[PDB]
Assembly symmetry: C5
Homo-oligomer: 206 residues x 5
């Protein structure tokens, strides 16, 4: 339909691509996790596999429009190929992340974007003692691979992972799941890098 | 042949692609499953593997033509890359879906589209008790990932999964298989999201 | 080289791609199999894995040329991406087919095409009794996914599968294999769909006689 | 640098791509193998897994230049996607080959090309007896899938496989490894087809 | 923002891509490793799996700009597809490397490029004795697949692998990890090829 075709043409065809954030124009990405399943533990390799979806939110002045000019359209669905998306990376993955959901984001007229990729992740986690009453704690950091806190900052709306869609017949019960903003430094670079640390305490369903 | 080449040029090389449904111009997708096989059960991970094909049907005013202007062509086969397709997603998959069929749809002159992809799906399912008389029940929801009920509604033509092509020598016998429209809500969003819940009761043959 | 570059530029750069067959302009695809190996049997899942090459042949008026206009060229090899190819699909695959050969077809001046992909297929097959003297029978149907018999018909040149290149040290001995045209109907659609049904009779290789 | 940019633009932006060899303009591909490892044996499926790199060499008049016109450049590295490469295929693979090296070739001013892809290959091989003093012999043929001997000929520079980079702590030791040109006919086609037969005799270390 | 969009347009849209190094304009790539985990050992195939990130650094005159003409911009992030990147390859891999990080480099106004890909590598390594106090030593060379020492030289900033991010609960403890420049010759070619030899001594925790 005609107004949406005109809006996407104006935002995407009639302009150069956003080159990502800079020290002079930084952005904040909001992250939140919905943990669906601890699928698998490998005690020979200390790898654990999670299925989750990761809510990402950011805002660009370059994606703003006036709904009055575009038939009162206030938001639209678009291919994530059409827009810049942040390079949010699991810092202790052992396999490439597997994508479980369509690469489609929602853009709102204030320039705000929400993108909610479902992923299967293999990460470094020692499951020794998962068969006990006290279980095991594992953690994985999610943040930009290449932008410091001077270009990409992160936040969470809450410290509590959403467990409302956790698989009730998983082999693993969740005892706690937190998502916490964290600062790290790396050998290569003096600047602080920001991540959200996902910390999960679990045990066999003891 | 010449009439079909003209039709495809007129439909695909003139307009921009359909930008998907909206609140002002919503779409109903019809979904149905043909279950071919329960291929694998993993009791160490509670993952079960299905092979099926999923019939999808929708209709766009933008895909209409007058057959009289195109040598009485009433439908054509086309690459699914040429057309918008709905983002129908399994909500509890544990692996990316494996595509088993050519990505080709049929478009009809009234603007109706049918697309029937074959898939192998791993999903969240506890098979504890599959070796018993009563067997086990597992369920997986299929719906738009990104469009609410205000842009994509769903329906089935029947609540009975088609079992007329179920593999006769499968390790697993199907006791029942249903496909039912449901409403769900998610933390992110106040709007209702529509799914078709595929519910399968099965046991070792 | 100059004459072939001219022919491919003329055939491929001047007109839209062939939009595939229609009820008005149907085509017949010839299929035949050369079975190279039964690689694997999965008795936990009733999956069996075949390696074969599949000879496909069809003919398009739009691929015709006069060899006298193109330095007496009578045929050429080309990327299978450059031409229409039939959507021949295994109906009981459990995994995406794996391609083992280059995607290159031969086009002949009469508009005939031959394309011989090598594939590894996992399909639905119960191997219970494969370790017996009699072995097991499995079958898989190959046909268009999307075109009825009104757009794509199939045939074989012979109902006998080519077993003369079967791997002599396979885990599995091939007893016989047939490739037979068949008509099917599906729930979605009233039109007949055509397949070639590949039937394989095999058993575990053990000096063991074949008697019936 | 300026002279190489000019050479690449002159070779690759001006003409249509080379349409491959013909009966009127045939080519010879030289092949040789460097065997790095027998990585795995599967006695349940009679599949063996090799890691090797394959030296391929051929010559096209269409890739010639005069070094004097391009700053005395006599050769250059280029993406294998920029040039025609031969469709050399293992005849008894059981899996798609896995590429282990960058897709980059070296073109020389006489029009000669050298391309040395590293591959992991699963092929048809019964390893029964590998744990014995005499070991086991397996073979795999490499050749064009689609070109006869009238369009592509093959040769070797030596019948000895290069074992100078064989992994010294492999599970398997090599007793012999040879590479031998052969000719045969196929049911589909009237002309002779060329292959190079890789024959490896090995045992447990 | 505007100054960065202008700089990228000037660097990438106005000239051909850099055609890689030559004997007349060679380059030096700095390499270093950050070892995150020895993930897996396969005693049946003598394959070991590493997770690491590899810091790569080089400098091109063609990537230089004056920050004064671009709003004081001194560096920028860019897709690795936008620029030339060196063909650094593990010489004893047994499977294609799996990429674990975004393909995004940083270009600085002096033309220097830093690119830090994270990878999972399967390579040739006999783990026999890893359960002992003395453990085992494995080695893998990293270098250009196609460029000799006349086009690509390598250096390290240190011969000590960075173990500051090694997984504290790995099955394997690192006893030592070194990264050392070395010269190799190959059968095909008389010229020296340069690699960085990654030597890791490890044992069961
Ligand atoms: O890849 C980059 C870049 C971009 C290239 C160098 O400027 C910056 C910083 C870092 N990396 C990779 C590692 C993970 N993230 C933090 C740190 C180490
Ligand atoms: O990805 C989206 C979008 C688009 C991005 C946000 O507006 C909407 C709604 C939802 N998701 C992802 C999850 C699954 N489906 C329902 C719900 C939660
Ligand atoms: O995908 C299609 C199409 C095209 C889409 C609907 O017109 C037709 C017919 C069928 N399919 C898929 C299944 C397998 N092949 C036969 C039958 C059922
Ligand atoms: O695919 C072709 C072609 C091209 C198509 C027919 O002209 C020629 C010859 C052959 N094949 C495939 C098989 C393997 N290689 C030799 C022989 C049989
Ligand atoms: O692929 C090439 C090239 C380019 C093609 C021949 O000029 C040069 C040299 C080598 N190779 C591959 C092997 C590994 N690296 C060193 C040596 C052997
Ligand atoms: C947009 O909003 C104004 C004010 O309510 C209304 O007059 C106009 O017709 C609307 N157009 C739409 C929804 O197409
Ligand atoms: C199309 O339909 C009309 C109406 O019956 C028919 O008479 C006409 O010949 C047809 N035209 C074609 C096939 O081009
Ligand atoms: C085509 O046909 C005849 C040989 O019968 C020959 O005289 C003519 O030169 C041929 N053309 C080419 C380019 O070979
Ligand atoms: C090419 O060759 C001669 C030396 O024989 C020399 O004069 C000339 O400068 C060389 N280099 C270039 C870049 O032309
Ligand atoms: C660039 O730097 C100079 C000197 O510090 C300053 O005066 C100028 O306004 C700066 N421009 C920017 C940040 O755009
Ligand atoms: Cl954007
Ligand atoms: Cl469309
Ligand atoms: Cl065609
Ligand atoms: Cl070429
Ligand atoms: Cl560059
Ligand atoms: K993007
Ligand atoms: K589509
Ligand atoms: K094709
Ligand atoms: K090529
Ligand atoms: K690159």
């Amino acid at each position: 339909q005609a107004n949406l075709m005109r809006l996407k043409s104006d935002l995407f065809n009639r302009s150069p691509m956003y080159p990502g954030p800079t020290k002079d124009d930084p952005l904040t990405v909001t992250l939140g996790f919905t943990l669906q399943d601890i699928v698998k533990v490998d005690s020979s390799t200390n790898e654990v596999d999670l299925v989750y979806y990761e809510q990402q939110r950011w805002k660009l002045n370059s994606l703003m429009w006036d709904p009055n000019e575009y038939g009162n359209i206030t938001d639209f669905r678009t291919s994530a190929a059409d827009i810049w998306t942040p390079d949010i990376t699991a810092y202790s993955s052992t396999r490439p992340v597997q994508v479980l959901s369509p690469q489609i984001a929602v853009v709102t007229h204030d320039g705000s974007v929400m993108f909610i990729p479902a992923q299967r992740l293999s990460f470094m986690c020692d499951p020794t003692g998962v068969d006990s009453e006290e279980g095991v704690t594992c953690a994985v950091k999610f943040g930009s691979w290449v932008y410091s806190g001077f270009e990409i900052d992160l936040k969470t709306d809450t410290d509590q992972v959403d467990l409302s869609s956790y698989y009730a017949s998983s082999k693993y019960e969740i005892l706690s799941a937190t998502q916490t903003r964290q600062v790290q430094h790396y050998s290569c670079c003096p600047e602080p890098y920001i991540d959200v640390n996902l910390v999960v305490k679990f045990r066999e369903r003891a």
